[PDB]
Design a protein around this nucleic acid. Structure first.
Ligand SMILES: [Zn+2]
Lengths: 106, 50, 249, 114
RNA sequence: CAACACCCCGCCCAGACCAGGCUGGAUCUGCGGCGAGUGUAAGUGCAGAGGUUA
RNA sequence: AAGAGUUGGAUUGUUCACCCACCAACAGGGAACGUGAGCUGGGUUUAGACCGUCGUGAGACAGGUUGGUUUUACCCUCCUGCCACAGA
RNA sequence: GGAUCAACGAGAUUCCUGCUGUCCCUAGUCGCUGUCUGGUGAACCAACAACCAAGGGAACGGGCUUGGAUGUGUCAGCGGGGA
RNA sequence: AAGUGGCAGUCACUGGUUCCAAUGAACAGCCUGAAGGAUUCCCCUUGUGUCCGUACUGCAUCACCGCAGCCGGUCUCCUCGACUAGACGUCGCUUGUCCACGGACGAAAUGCAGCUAAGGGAAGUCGGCAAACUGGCCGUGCACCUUUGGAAGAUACGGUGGCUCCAGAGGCCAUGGCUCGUGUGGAACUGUUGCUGUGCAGGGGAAUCUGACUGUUUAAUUGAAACCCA
RNA sequence: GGCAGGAAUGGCAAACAGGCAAGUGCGAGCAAGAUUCUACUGUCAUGGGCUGGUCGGUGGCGACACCCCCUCCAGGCAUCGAACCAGUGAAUCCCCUGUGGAGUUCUCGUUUCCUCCUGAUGCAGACUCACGCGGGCUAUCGAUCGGCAUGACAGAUGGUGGUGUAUGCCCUUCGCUCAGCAAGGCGGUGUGGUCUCACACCGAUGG
RNA sequence: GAGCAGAUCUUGGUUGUAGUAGCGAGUACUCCACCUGGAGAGGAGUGGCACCCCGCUGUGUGCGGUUGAGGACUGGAGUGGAGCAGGUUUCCACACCAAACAGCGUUGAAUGUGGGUCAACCGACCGUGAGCCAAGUGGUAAGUUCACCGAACAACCAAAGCUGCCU
RNA sequence: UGAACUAUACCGUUCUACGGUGAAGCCAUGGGAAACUGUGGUGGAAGCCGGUCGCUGUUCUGACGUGCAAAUUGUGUAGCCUGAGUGC
RNA sequence: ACCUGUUGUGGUGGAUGUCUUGGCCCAGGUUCUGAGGAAGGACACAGCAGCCUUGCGAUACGUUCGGUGAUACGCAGAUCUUGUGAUCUGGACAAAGGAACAGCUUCGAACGCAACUGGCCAGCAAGGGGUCCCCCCGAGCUGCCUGUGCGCCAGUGUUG
């Protein structure tokens, strides 16, 4: 019958671990992750669930390249907060710097 | 059962490794540290999804 | 509310044919130079039972048209056809049982089966157990031919359509009353998911235009129109008449 | 006798399929074990058309025993040997001979009626 | 302090537990006997349908 | 004059009714039409189903029919026995 | 679908036989409970409380009014009440 | 020289026989033949066999699911001796286990279970509900009705132990030796008339309504006359 | 690059189907793995190096038997339902005789119980007329000869060749003998020191 | 975001009930011995005795584990032996039960530590089946869990990348 | 999102004691002028019967109903058990 | 003894008060990802480490270099001091010099084909190792659409 005695026949596995999201949401039979939708290249995400986005947004993982580019951006930003940028070499000093270098090394 | 995938076996081994209590020397770390291991599973209590 | 059985069948998910263990299409050898100009010989190599079909089939082996080979075609068997029979296919074939020849070399009394409906087509008419057509008449003005079909109809088909001479084997099988429900169970288990058949008066109005009511009945005329949408096209579809058939049909 | 007289599957299949077929032998160590059988194929046969009868003079080997077997286990020393029985070979010969004779008769009689 | 009551240890005319009754040289545990219930114990020597052997 | 009594059955889910008897007599009533954490569940009154009539229909029917989970007390009191303290 | 209808039915009904604690009309016996107990030990429910009669009253009160009882506290039960 | 102690169930193979308006996979791989063509003349990472699973549990009374260490559920394989028709049921060797919260008191009332009960025998009750009767096998035998198949185990009658015998079937070696009916029939004796002695194990008959039958059904209140069938 | 062939895209998908090949001591020795380690005894698939004369040959009446690469086509094995009957074999189980050990013995019981075993593998053997288990085919003979016969539980056969006979020929399940192999195992009886354990001896290779 | 007695108000902590109802399917235990801080049982039991000793007196039907001796159950469709799915270290050993859990606790699937899973022959892997994907093409405003899977069976399709000899 | 319960289709695959009964076909045989027919066997069919595993779930309207259990339970009682059977 | 009460005290409990490396709000600036492999997901990596880390990748709580300048620390253990020098810090990050710019397992747009497989013991192959062969290891190349170029082609398309 419905409950206790049919909960015993409940072995098997509809879903197993997905290789994109590491979540036990990858449907075995129809090989489709129920969370990220693995086989298709886009990641599955709907606006009707902000929490589901929150749980995957950039900033919840290593960010092992975006953290570096963001720290670089932070260096630049906290320089430009001190003072607007001033290019070291421009059209008006290239020649002077270059001939100074030339005479100094010659 | 005996039948496994290599991925499943690596995951089960990592879970076995995680299933460990905090070192003794960790509480003494000056800025008050963890007292006990709050992420600790037991085969009876909670099952792995896998 | 909900769709109808004959509307969920056409969707074709679990109503597909149970054809996995069948033999394939049973058709006449295709039209080539030999079968058009003269005749080609084929050996009836085997007679076999096909699942879901009432007539036995025949693996008949011909030579390849242009290759060193042997093409083993498969056609519904003619009654009396035996293994090793040497059937003949073509325009200059003789009027013998099992031979396949155009509908023009046939006199106006011939009994034919495996009849084509189009030229170069391959045996789309008179193919069930004990089925046979009768060549009524020829017209050389058009190159066409009136034939009487098992249904009792009279169809006009070109005189280049090829038939097979004789009856379709396995005849007489509706002359045995199925005695049990299990016989029809095994019958349809190899054809398709169509048996048993719940009748619509026994359903609820959500499942069929006939369901519901405190007495099992149809409250409206059963004879439904031909322009009836799919979903209210249940009952007697565009019936020209009803009741017991007496006198002429 | 030792350890009882009940037995146990020893391979990775616990279903009574046509490929398990244990044998229940008794070992030198007074034990009782199973040894698995092997499928004995039907060996070559005459065509389904010509009666599906076994051909004598050939031993039944599985596929790879057939690949590695001596030639006498596989062949016979007749025409169509190993592929046809002597009777079918004989009717084949006689049908061929008589049909060629009739062909000769008819072509020479038509070149006569010329 | 004693005097008594109660508890533990005993027995039931009593009792769900309590309560009630009786008892301390009491009693308890056996043994013997009587009356009773069954129906003629094992072991060992009267017939036994027959078969078997000298 | 209300002390004691006022029964056994057949049909019917029946109260009632109606018969068969017995008897001194087989009176009439109440108690949340006493009494379902007392019982039963026959009936009414779900979901299933059949018939009849009604309705185009789904469906209706003091028209008939069949089949259909009645849970909990250890609280307080009353009652029944039981016991102690009586100290306030 | 109307009427017969063999066989079948955990279908509905009626009769007969046999058998019976269903009953007259109950009794005895037994296991596991309960009962006493060592260890452990919840929940339902809870305005506050917890003896009645009559009266009046949201017309059926535990409280109000007029009476009658009532020492406090138990243990096992109990199904009248706590609409 | 080179089957053979016995015979029971299981397994395997073999030879078949029945059933189907049902005829009961494919692929890789392998082999033979037919016709052509062509034809110089022991040693090596103990050669190579790389990669992954390999513990234990697993009809679990504690390893899974059921919130749990839940009397539920959950796939397959092996499967001894005696009684017996037996994979029923009862008991025993092998294996495993004594773990389920216990103890006293003959242990109230009530209860849930097992039994009995004189005389009567449905008077109980909506209603024979519940329980009881019967029960295996052998022999004799069996009615109405019938779709001729059944009904039917109709209904019914008799027997059944123990022991001692008498008949009764076969096989091998060579009509004698040996094996040899746990399989049947009869008789004598026997017993406090009692024997399918235990577990097990139909009560029967006669009608009306209804669905032909078998099958199906609302998991968790309805199993039906409903659905399905031919 | 030339010539000659070559329709019909690449995969996934069964830890029950298809699909090469391993058994015993279940041990040397494990606390815990074992057709995986170990000791023996095998099996399978596959690669490389080396050393004027060409349709493999022959025997049998036959069924057939023996010794010495390439292309294409035709077939076949893989390969297939279920039930029932009969046969043979296996292990289990039991019986008889005997042995070794043990239980009972108040009386009886030549009694009661255990054990007395044998795997894969072998280009080993004898049969195969299965003279143990049965089908197919061959040759000879030519039936029903007037009562047709043969063989089966039942079928089933036979001038489309029965019965009978024989160098008969083939395949297969077995079984049997041998090697494995008794050295192992099983039931015991002892010696030696003892030890962080090896030797000795006996006991059905029964029907 | 400014006052609580209520909203079957929300969150938390509690109380009575109550040491109560209970912890009653799967037949069952018993004796000796050892393991203990104690477990044939005492808090300074009591009189001498001045702790030893000698007397007297009390002890709950008695924790746990494991040998052995009995009594019983499983009774081969097993409470036995193997493996599937699931579990995922629960396997083994030692320490340890005075942290907690096991409706006891010298025991355990508990806790802590440390170990353990060896393959040419057992299986996945090789394909194929039902079915699916890419490709090819098409549909859609557009991605798609959009369509087709067609060597029985498709198309709108230039998918033979391989083989023999010469080089 | 879900076909792990559950419904159904397909692919592969598994399981199905012991009895009763006795269909066709067959053997011997009695009768008959013949057509036909009596008897004794053999044989082992059936969506046949009893009945085990198993599945289902009638009845007690039993247990439980703060349960063993959000559907189980009985030292009961029942339905089917070669098939339209059954599971994976 | 029990109950009721009032105090004192002790428990159970976590209300209050005070704060806060947190949030919320407003304003300003930037928006700086990826086939040269992103965002995410795995598995690894510490003497004693399980978790966490916008730690890290077989160079694995870190490597080079710069700024700083004696610590780090829960234990220990050798390195380290007027110094190539402990620690912390800076996008592997400053050098104005076209000087200098390391490494980064594995899935993932995920890229040879697949994959519930670390499979096909893929094809080709620089090299390294064991012994011309052969054997083992093996960097690296092989994804699609589109664009351009190069090579080879196809067409009873138009022509010569
Ligand atoms: Zn995913």
């Amino acid at each position: 019958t419905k409950g206790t005695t049919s909960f015993g026949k409940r072995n098997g596995r509809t879903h197993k671990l997905c290789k994109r999201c590491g979540k036990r949401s990858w449907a075995v039979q129809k090989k489709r992750c129920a969370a990220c939708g693995y086989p298709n290249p886009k990641m599955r995400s709907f606006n009707w669930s902000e929490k589901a986005k929150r749980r995957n947004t950039m900033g919840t993982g290593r960010m092992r390249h975006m953290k570096n580019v963001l720290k670089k951006a932070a260096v630049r930003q906290r320089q430009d907060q001190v003072a607007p940028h001033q290019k070291r070499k421009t059209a008006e000093n290239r020649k002077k710097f270059a001939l100074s270098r030339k005479t100094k090394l010659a | 059962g005996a039948i496994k995938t290599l991925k499943q076996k690596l995951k089960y081994g990592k879970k076995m490794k995680q299933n460990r209590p905090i070192p003794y020397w960790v509480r003494f770390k000056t800025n008050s540290k963890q007292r006990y291991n709050e992420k600790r599973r037991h085969w009876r209590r909670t099952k792995l999804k896998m | 509310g909900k769709p109808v059985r004959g509307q969920r069948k056409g969707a074709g998910s679990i109503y597909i044919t149970h054809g996995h263990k069948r033999q394939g299409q049973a058709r006449l050898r295709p039209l080539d130079y030999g079968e058009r100009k003269g005749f080609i010989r084929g050996v009836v190599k085997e007679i076999v039972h096909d699942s879901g079909r009432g007539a036995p089939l025949a693996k008949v082996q011909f030579r390849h048209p242009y290759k060193f080979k042997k093409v083993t075609h498969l056609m519904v068997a003619c009654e009396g056809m035996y293994v090793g029979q040497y059937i003949y296919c073509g325009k200059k074939a003789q009027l013998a049982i099992g031979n396949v020849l155009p509908l023009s070399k046939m006199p106006e009394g011939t009994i034919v089966c495996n009849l084509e409906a189009k030229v170069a087509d391959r045996s789309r008419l008179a193919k069930a157990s004990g089925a046979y057509a009768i060549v009524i008449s020829h017209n050389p003005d058009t190159g066409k031919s009136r034939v009487k079909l098992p249904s009792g109809q009279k169809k006009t088909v070109s005189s280049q359509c090829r038939a097979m001479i004789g009856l379709i084997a396995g005849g007489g099988r509706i002359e045995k009353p199925v005695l049990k429900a299990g016989n029809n169970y095994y019958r349809f288990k190899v054809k398709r998911n169509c048996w048993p058949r719940v009748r619509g008066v026994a359903m609820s109005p959500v499942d069929h235009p006939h369901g519901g009511g405190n007495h099992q009945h149809i409250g409206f005329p059963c004879t439904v129109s031909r322009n009836a949408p799919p979903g209210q096209k249940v009952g007697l579809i565009a019936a020209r008449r009803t009741g017991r058939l007496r006198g002429g049909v | 006798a030792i350890g009882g007289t009940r037995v146990r599957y020893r391979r990775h299949n616990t279903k009574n399929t046509r490929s398990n077929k244990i044998r229940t032998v008794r070992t030198p160590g007074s034990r009782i074990t199973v040894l698995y059988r092997k499928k004995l194929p039907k060996g070559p046969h005459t065509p389904v058309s010509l009666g599906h009868k076994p051909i004598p003079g050939v031993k039944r080997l599985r596929s790879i025993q057939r690949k590695s077997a001596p030639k006498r286990h596989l062949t016979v020393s007749r025409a169509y040997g190993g592929c046809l029985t002597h009777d079918l070979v004989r009717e084949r010969i006689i049908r061929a001979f008589l049909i060629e004779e009739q062909k000769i008769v008819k072509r020479v009689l038509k070149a006569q009626s010329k």
